[PDB]
Amino acid sequence: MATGQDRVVALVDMDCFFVQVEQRQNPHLRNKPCAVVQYKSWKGGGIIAVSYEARAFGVTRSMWADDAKKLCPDLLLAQVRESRGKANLTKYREASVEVMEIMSRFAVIERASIDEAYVDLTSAVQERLQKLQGQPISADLLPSTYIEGLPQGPTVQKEGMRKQGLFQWLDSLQIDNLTSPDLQLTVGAVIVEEMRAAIERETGFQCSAGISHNKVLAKLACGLNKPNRQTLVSHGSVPQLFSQMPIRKIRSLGGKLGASVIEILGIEYMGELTQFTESQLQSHFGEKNGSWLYAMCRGIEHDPVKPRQLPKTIGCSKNFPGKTALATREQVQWWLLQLAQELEERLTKDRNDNDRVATQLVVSIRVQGDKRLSSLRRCCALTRYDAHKMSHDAFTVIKNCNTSGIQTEWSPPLTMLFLCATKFSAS
Template sequence: MRGDEAKRVCPGINLVQVPVARGKANLNLYRSAGAEVVAILASKGKCERASIDEVYLDLTDAAKEMLLQAPPDSPEGIFMEATKSNILGLPADASEKEKNVRAWLCQSEADYQDKLLACGAIIVAQLRVRVLEETQFTCSAGIAHNKMLAKLVSGMYKPAQQTVVPSSSVQDLLASLPVKKMKQLGGKLGSSLQDDLGVETIGDLLSFTEEKLQEQYGVNTG
């Protein structure tokens, strides 16, 4: 909704406009703020800027180091902010959430990949607290084994929350995900999947073989 439309609907609204330079929005303030956040995140891993207010952070090495030197082996010793994580696949009982999250984060018999995710969740929680303390900015985050999944869930719970995607929850996450929500499928290709194959969700897409998709869209795209 444009500003003039908003004023017609709500005459008392106060609109805030970004600074303008040379007839265009001046985003230097936001870039500077983003740089402050990235500087903190980069203390734990390699950062890749995705947009003015989004960044991918590779925590693989930091998570491996934590798992080797100081693994989360006691529910009582878990960093408090990490216990507020939203972990896909855990029971939805709100009254037991913190207890369940603590147990998941220090599960001693989990596979190696989930242990790395648990360490990653703790590190991200620590970083988010640092960002808040040092810049007064809040952050939401997605923690997963790849950028695509992390991006998908980073905005699932807001504001100032984080979501973890264990490997066992990936299929359920994608099964009902609208195809247009998937990166690179939001444009013409996504529309083609809907029109040509009747695909509405990623779960629908998984019912087609690679050969069928290559036959329809070519070897590279399929």
Template structure:
């Protein structure tokens, strides 16, 4: 589907959009054959417009958005739907009395700069509401998270979630973790449980999530461990915290926080090789030894003999000094024992002595 007028193949930009549409069609077909998933696609001049075009005709459709149709498309798009304008920045712009991208195009650069304070931010908003996006498309090396989720048409109780849906979602997530581990040699460290439920304070339905440590078990036991961990989180959120109330209309399990796993072929020698490379030292553990001539062998033998003699001499001197120190310590201790004074007698000061002390009669036996 094409938004706006038909493409003019005499124009280079429209010709590029047509080629992009052919590539997107082929990719969607390959995804369906391999994964049995339907895919929607958007073809335009940048990431922002392609995203809006892909959401225009879902499901299993692709949409071409030429630049001539951009003003009509962006006219009724809410500011909150634009990338980067969903938070505080979007609220600041709404304070000027605008709520859609079409209304924001009437604001000039000076007005935006006075309101937002910085020229760079004002320039970003000025281009964004007009469908201009200069960010490059970067190839994603690996996914940051793995998700298995389910939306319920009929609201479910905890028993239904525990007996029916958690085992299915945990098994699907475990299969994705195994495939990702084999492809990227990494392990997930965090398990996030997301759900949609009612608030006990009467504020209606809310989306909430809780995180816990991913069970580090074998592939066969991981499914049951994920079910147990998710069930514990749900019981804590609904029973102990008492913030949420059943029934549940959505449940999701996400594996995140990946870390690389060391390969089995790595050894301690490779660790020291990496450390030596960082420090600039050379590691010649595996370097071939050169053949020595007879003269070199004799010289090496003399050096070893001399080193051995030096070690023996040093050891002998150390022993003599140690024994001399022991004898000296014993002599000092004996001298202290001989010079040790006896118990001191208490002496009275002269100023406290009286005449009666000298003429005190002795006690005589009768």
């Protein structure tokens, strides 16, 4: 009976990352309710990142800025840079690289998004445990750490509660056994306090972390005590944790599959999966999903932290909603050329920085009237980092989609253009 305690895994997550990047650059905005927007001319801008001050008012991602100002009249905004008619994330990718390089000094990380990485600390934990003689862990080593499900048993202030929970954990900690999985988690989190202490010292950014035994738990745990805090979710907190945890809060159960787990099975919380056999779960959801759900609701997951701090694709997309859909052939050239131009800037940087070339160009369009994120994906070869050739070749492989009999028109009008560089080879 194996219990998924073999690894120590952490998930770190930059608290409102884009906001922090803007607040480091423009100090005026620090410690105020503020958000980052892109494209101001439509309803003040779509909001893509919201500080915690601003969230206390209810400002959320994907509002329009004009609606966020209704909820938060003193809300400060920063706008994303625009390059060649489109939002340009280069400042945030560069802060992201800053943080990931720091994290890498500690343990191998899997970049998961521009603002989070997973951390396999199985190996760093063993080494620390031998430098540590066997001496107890001081509560002073975990000054921003919450123990989930503690305190329990026979203080009205938040910091008060945390200390009581950490004292209880440490008081019962079995430091003489260099193999108790709870002790490894504790050491895992000491390493995460230091790793987080150095992000802040060396970039000024604050972040939250989750320390558990796999990636799903660490990600849940990270969310439990935001902002600027870390949470140990031990194997033993799982039954109480999952007992009232909605299915949709576990990673990858937030969409259609989770909804079917809810409907088909007639349950609400992750804990309720444990009453079904593995073959039962497989019969509703397939061999892989039933297996995955059977182990997960018992706190067991095996997805490895992959040693991958660089993306597999470089992508450049722009939407054209509404009357702004592209209706003329020479409109479609121009944006393609705009898209191929930013793609080229970024490809050359990536060759120079990271020693690889992309070999396949993926083009994708949206048609006025279709339903889905994409309406069509097509590819060709990517042999030169040249905007004019990349955009020419991208046109070539989409020109037949033009249903219009006219040459100078384009029917149906295009609602999105997308270029993606993939298939990387060492350079």
